[PDB]
Amino acid sequence: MDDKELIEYFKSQMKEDPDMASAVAAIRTLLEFLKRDKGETIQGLRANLTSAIETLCGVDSSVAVSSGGELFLRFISLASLEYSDYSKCKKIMIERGELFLRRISLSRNKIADLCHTFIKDGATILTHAYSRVVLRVLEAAVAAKKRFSVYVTESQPDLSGKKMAKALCHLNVPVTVVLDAAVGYIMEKADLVIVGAEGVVENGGIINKIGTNQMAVCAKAQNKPFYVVAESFKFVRLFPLNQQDVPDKFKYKAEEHPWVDYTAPSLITLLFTDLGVLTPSAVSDELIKLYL
Template sequence: MEGEEISKYFLKIIEHEDVSVGIAAIRTLMEIINKTASTTVQGLDENIKDGISIMKRSHYPVAAIDSGCELFVRFITLTRLDTHFEECKRIMLKRGNLYLKHHNRSRNTIVTSASKLIGDGVRILTHSRSRVVLQTLREAAKQKRKFEVYVTISEPDKSGLELCKQLEIDGIPHVAILDSSVGYIMEQIDFVMIGAECVVESGGVVNKIGSYTMAVCAREMNKPFYVLTESFKFSRLFPLGQQDLPLEYKYDNYSNSTDFKKVHPLVDYTPPSFITLLFTDIGILTPSAVSDELIKLYL
């Protein structure tokens, strides 16, 4: 597959199907493997690396693409394949399909456990538009629970308003609030529930800009801060603070910018000390347990 073809395939999945950026990236890698013109494993590795680079140049979160692809590539090349190329390719595709099949079910696992948090009369604060959070809210509504959701508008792309439109369709009571009113509204809510672009080795998360501010307010007012995320978003990144995040995570087309002080970051880092629990497809985890799970995933 050529660069333009890879980009179009990746964007078509995102624009026409309700899947996360990470899953779209993994499916694109599967297509690259399936259609590769290479006749060697080394050549296929280069095709995969090139494909990841092309997807990272899109306007979608690089953190989600990076974390999803990293674990996927590790899984399909888990052991050295001492066989001819076509058989090696067949095994990779088989492993890839197994990987996708597992993670296509992962959101349902998270929703089942996280929806139990939502009882009658609960008021929830969320940020941006997370598919797994939306599905969890829908599940609670399906069980006839009465609750209310406060949604930040989530500048600069106003993705929170997209979530509000979907909540409106589902008949779920909600209120759109300014990002700057998080501190004001925090005393009225019962807990915070957000998604994540990726989960780092410390148990902290990288997510839409403003997540860290929300977490600081939540801890100050003793409100639980829950993160809902699939395990394919676990990454071996270990930031100590905001400045340790890769520039490509924080800035769109960062390589074309010369003065980052004049560009708004797209994501921020929420340290593990601000997170109450992470609801994942491999269990409900404390932030300190993430490192152990990463070791298991990458073994």
């Protein structure tokens, strides 16, 4: 499989279904690459998959793509540990990959059904920018016949907050748009903050759009619960010590304008994943359980 057709398949699966996220598209492209590789050794298989992951992360500078890459490499490593013969291992891999794709396709609805019960009637929800998982949880909460008012931040560098407001008014949910600088002004009117995450780091913190850290610190200062809804495949084994420790491949190209920031686990109340409702300390355990 050529590099050009790899990028073409990635872009085609991203464009065909805008609802589906970037990490799922990357994992699908990697599984499609593994589908037709015409190889005979698992060593070259691993090397080719790693190179495909590097070029895919070259296409998109998101943390979720790299998360999916490491998760997929671990999946191949475990499958190889199960079976030594290349043909049996490869067929086991393709069936397991199909099951994995099926399970990660429906994570959003599980997170919605597990998180919509934390919204109360007459609550005031603050969210940062556009995130399909937050849209899904709010849709499920509305389907639960609950009435609430949503606040959203315009998300200045690309106005995805306005897109969130439009996609929320589509279902006639009362929503409001505030500036990036008005977040500290709005915290006291909101009851809880719900955000997504492009990547969940080892210690339980998150990587997200540049304005997430401000909301986390403001909510902590005003004693408001901070909920993060994120998928399992966004679990990177990263340990940022500060904002400078975040890898530069995720900050830029996605005066000086970073596109992401890191939020410490002490500023997060609970994480809503397809694994369930977890404390941040659980996430690390998961990773420790994954890599032996």
